[PDB]
């Protein structure tokens, strides 16, 4: 079947250390409980994780001979796994809402309450946690000064060019740099797909993380599991959970192109609350997870080992400049006061446009 190999990584201690960091961390009290409290009150919509905090917490707790390993190295080596570890840790440690909630607007929770009052009354299904989840999880690459604080080479960042990315960087967290050219529209993406069962007990759920999807034919309802059919299952649009999806491509800067070459491109997927944070025609510093994509979508039955690759966005620094539509601020008010004191202006403005031309 499949031969087995031994690796020094074990997720039990990693999860325990993650929970201890999330609970005990002091930067108001702990910060990571303040974010969870705001999420519980349906105020915050996404959670951002700073690796600098993890690094410095581990470094400062190393002074006592209890810590044995490091987490940021495993974060850099692999990222997707730690996403579900973090979401599980958050779901386990979600505090109660300290604020009132307009409970009538959450139609999803109302429908789920109706289903529960149906099933549990009889004395029920354990729904997947991601359906109950409302927040989004994002990572933030560390800063170079934090690495300089210590001896270790916890660097990352380093905004490589498009062509500098090789086949050994799949699965790692890398930062790129380039000009955004094409930006698509915003369209919903499915996360959990629900079917109704034609008033036959529980309504079957399904979740698909693939880029393709197949529907069900029969259902596990007891009267439907009875030896004759009782109603055809139908997909329900209201009960399902969706997510915003967007895609874009980035091109290399003309300064980084080697002589006698043609610049290459790179595809970027973005989902969640970060959608529409970038516009075509700007220089950006994008950090994300470099993931492979199957070729089977093209359905050519060729390239048995060749695969397509894409980057999933995690944090975007818009950079470039801001026009600001001359929004009034104090500093520019003293600037225009200085201009008022300057006297006649237009002659100096004419002198100051193109001094290179005589």
């Amino acid at each position: 079947a499949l031969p087995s190999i031994q690796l020094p990584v074990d997720y039990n201690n990693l999860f325990n250390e993650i929970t201890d960091f999330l609970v005990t961390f002091k930067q108001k009290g702990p910060k990571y409980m303040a974010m969870l409290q705001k999420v519980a009150n349906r105020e915050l919509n996404s959670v951002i994780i700073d690796l600098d905090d993890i690094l410095q917490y581990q470094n400062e707790k190393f002074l006592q001979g209890t810590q044995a390993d490091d987490l940021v190295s495993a974060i850099q080596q692999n990222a997707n796994h730690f996403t579900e570890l973090f979401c599980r840790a958050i779901d386990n440690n979600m505090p109660l809402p300290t604020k009132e909630i307009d409970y009538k607007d959450d139609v999803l929770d109302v429908i789920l309450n109706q289903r529960r009052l149906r099933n549990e009354r009889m004395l029920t299904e354990l729904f997947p946690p991601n359906l109950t989840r409302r927040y989004f999880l994002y990572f933030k690459p560390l800063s170079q000064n934090c690495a300089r604080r210590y001896r270790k080479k916890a660097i990352s960042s380093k905004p490589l060019s498009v062509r500098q990315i090789k086949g050994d960087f799949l699965g790692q967290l890398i930062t790129v740099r380039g000009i955004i050219t094409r930006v698509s529209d915003v369209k919903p993406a499915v996360e959990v797909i629900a079917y109704t069962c034609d008033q036959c007990g529980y309504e079957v759920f399904q979740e698909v993380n693939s880029r393709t999807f197949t529907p069900l034919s029969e259902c596990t309802s007891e009267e439907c599991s009875q030896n004759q059919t009782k109603g055809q299952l139908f997909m329900s649009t209201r009960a399902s959970k969706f997510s915003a999806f967007q895609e874009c491509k980035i091109q290399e800067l003309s300064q980084q192109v080697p002589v006698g070459h043609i610049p290459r491109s790179l595809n970027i997927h973005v989902n969640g609350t970060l959608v529409r944070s970038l516009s075509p025609g700007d220089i950006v510093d994008v950090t994300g997870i470099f993931l492979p994509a199957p070729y089977t979508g093209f359905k050519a039955l060729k390239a048995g080992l060749l695969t397509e690759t894409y980057l999933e966005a995690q944090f975007v620094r818009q950079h470039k400049k801001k026009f600001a539509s001359f929004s009034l601020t104090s500093d520019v008010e003293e600037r225009v006061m200085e201009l008022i004191t300057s006297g006649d202006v237009y002659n100096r403005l004419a002198k100051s446009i193109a001094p290179e031309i005589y």
Partner: protein, 649 residues
């Protein structure tokens, strides 16, 4: 069975016999270790062996490699990997990076004998044999990584599993095919999650190499072959480069022997798994005594005239043209400013003259003696296809831009013949390049600016059959003034009839035709020759073998050979960046003011852009004498050359 072990131990014995490879491997290891955790380059795990020593050690293994490498290379690679593993010493390794298992693939160099072929000579009986082919790079594919070995983990078991995938092109030996099906369930049904960051992916690119059209049968089109290379050296060279590729020539695919065939006449597919690539360049590194000699020649008083006279010794006269070519091949520096944007740095030269005055021959000489140049004809070109093209890749199924003629010549020189006969439309495509040295392609959904900082040299005929000295210079030239103003230097040549010059040129031309190649008799024509005896190639200062340059004695002034001149150009274009000073500034401004207000007839009008030409000519002359500062002598010689090119002596 056991033959693998026998070959492995024999190769280990051979590796232990020669101590150079061990030194190289341990040097690579120590460099890699130093790169790890000390306040971006990494050495690939590849070593090149010289099979001459292998032949001198064991002829059986040498013959087995050169005849059937499929049964000999893998044992050698296994033995090399085992040696590297044994010698390696890392007490605290990493987790994901330790499972790379790089097998230390090999490269070869040395005499091949009858296995150095050309793309036309490859035939049936050369299959499954190591070969080395010369050629020119035609086109390349896109770099796409491919999977090798996947890593899986199950939460319940806690045991990491791995599955290995190989294809026909992955390994030299055919094995049972394996699809790309991801294992997602265990034997007991446990869920398996694919672990990125622990799996293995290797880069992949396909290129096509073409036989050189110069050495082709009469009335036959050139033929080409395709080369697959992966992992390292994945993106070396570019289209339009002369290369020598060493690898295994093998077939692949069923090729219709299955039930998919439709007709009788079904042929197989042939392909070369490239092992190594070398730049031919028809070598590029200076020695210590070479630098000594270059300095000794540059400290002389009259190096520039000697170098100018050294260019194309078979062309009579045109000395100022030779000097202009010399200054153009090593022109001034480019300037960039935070507010001034960009300033042009090099020189372009245009020549016009009546027929049969040796312009095309000088153009061919400049092609031959330049570091990089591309030949172009006005009639046989299209402007849209001159810059970029849209082609759909057969593999990926997408359309990608293909580099045009001028883009390939970036940081080079382009020569165009029959320029005045070239279509007016495409002329604008040239003017764009002369504007900002950048071409913009906005077509079919691609918006990209491509850098092209080349210099252009062209020669054109006047509108009439012969030049009329009594007419307006604008009247004699068909090109519009808009592009004519771009060229820094304009030269007009005429074959004035004079019996003294006629006798001199007749004697010179007759002298040239009475020539015989060394060591070959005069009764039979020139015959083609084979390649170099060595497939891959590689007491000081007391000999001056080719340093002084004077091969044959004909005049008191010296001469230099083509290779020494090219080495001088290579040294000058890199090691010196001169800075102008005010002493030359005074002369430049004085002569510009004088020339502008002389108020007499002239070949062409002058404007503010000529002072830029003077500045970059002074920079080029400072580069010629290898100085970091610009002296007034360079200003004087530049002014004299400009006056000659515009007034006439």
């Amino acid at each position: 069975d056991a033959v693998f072990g026998d070959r492995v131990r024999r190769f280990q014995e051979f590796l232990d016999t020669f101590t150079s490879y061990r030194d190289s491997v341990r040097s690579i290891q120590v460099y890699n270790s130093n790169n790890a955790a000390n306040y971006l380059n990494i050495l690939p795990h590849r070593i090149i062996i010289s099979l001459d020593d292998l032949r001198e050690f064991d002829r059986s293994f040498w013959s087995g490699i050169l005849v059937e490498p499929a049964y000999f290379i893998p044992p050698a690679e296994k033995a090399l990997t085992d040696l590297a593993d044994s010698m390696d010493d890392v007490p605290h390794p990493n987790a994901s990076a330790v499972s790379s298992r790089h097998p230390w693939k090999l490269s070869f160099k040395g005499s091949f004998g009858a296995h150095a072929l050309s793309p036309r000579t490859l035939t049936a009986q050369h299959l499954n044999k190591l070969v080395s082919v010369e050629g020119i790079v035609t086109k390349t594919s896109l770099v796409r990584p491919k999977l090798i070995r996947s890593v899986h983990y199950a939460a319940k078991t806690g045991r990491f599993h791995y599955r290995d995938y190989t294809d026909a092109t992955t390994t030299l030996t055919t094995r049972i095919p394996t699809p790309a099906i991801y294992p997602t369930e265990d034997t007991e049904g446990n869920k398996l999650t694919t672990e990125y960051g622990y799996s293995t992916f290797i880069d992949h690119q396909r290129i096509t190499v073409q036989e050189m059209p110069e050495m082709a049968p009469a009335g036959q089109l050139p033929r080409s072959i395709d080369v697959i290379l992966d992992d390292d050296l994945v993106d070396k060279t570019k289209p339009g480069d002369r290369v020598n590729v060493v690898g295994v020539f093998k077939s692949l695919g069923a090729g219709g022997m299955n039930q998919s065939n439709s007709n009788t006449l079904i042929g197989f597919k042939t392909l070369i798994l490239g092992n190594t690539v070398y730049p031919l360049h028809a070598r590029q590194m200076l020695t210590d005594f070479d630098i000594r000699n270059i300095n000794k020649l540059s400290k002389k008083k009259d190096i520039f005239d000697i170098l100018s006279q050294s260019l194309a010794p078979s062309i009579y006269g045109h000395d100022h043209i030779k000097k202009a070519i010399l200054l153009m091949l090593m022109g001034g520096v480019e300037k960039n400013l935070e507010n001034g944007s960009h300033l042009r740095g090099d020189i372009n030269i245009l020549m016009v003259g009546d027929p049969s005055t040796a312009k095309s021959q000088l153009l061919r000489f400049v092609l031959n003696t330049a570091s990089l140049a591309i030949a172009t004809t006005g009639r046989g070109s299209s402007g849209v296809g001159l810059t970029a093209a849209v082609t759909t890749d057969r593999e990926t199924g997408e359309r990608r831009l293909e580099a045009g003629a001028m883009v390939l010549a970036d940081r080079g020189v382009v020569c165009i013949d029959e320029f005045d006969k070239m279509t007016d439309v495409d002329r604008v495509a040239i003017h764009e390049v002369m504007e900002q040295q950048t071409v913009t392609i906005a077509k079919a959904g691609i918006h990209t600016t491509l850098n092209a900082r080349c210099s252009v040299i062209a020669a054109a005929n006047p509108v009439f059959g012969q030049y009329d000295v009594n007419r307006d210079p604008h009247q004699n030239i068909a090109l519009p003034d808009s592009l004519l103003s771009r060229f820094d230097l304009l030269f007009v040549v005429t074959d004035d009839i004079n019996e003294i010059r006629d006798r001199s040129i007749s004697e010179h031309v007759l002298r040239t035709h009475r020539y015989l190649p060394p060591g070959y008799l005069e009764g039979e024509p020139v015959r083609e020759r084979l390649n170099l005896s060595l497939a891959v190639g590689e007491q000081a200062g007391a000999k001056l073998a080719k340093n002084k340059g004077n091969y044959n004695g004909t005049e008191i002034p010296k001469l230099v050979t083509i290779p020494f001149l090219r080495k001088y150009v290579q040294y000058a274009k890199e090691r010196v960046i001169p800075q102008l000073t005010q002493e030359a500034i005074n002369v430049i401004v004085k002569n510009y003011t004088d020339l502008r207000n002389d108020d007499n007839t002239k070949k062409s009008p002058i404007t503010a852009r000529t002072l830029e030409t003077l500045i970059r000519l002074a920079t080029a002359h400072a580069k010629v004498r290898l100085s970091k500062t610009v002296n007034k002598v360079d200003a004087k010689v530049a002014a004299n050359l400009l006056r000659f090119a515009l007034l006439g002596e």
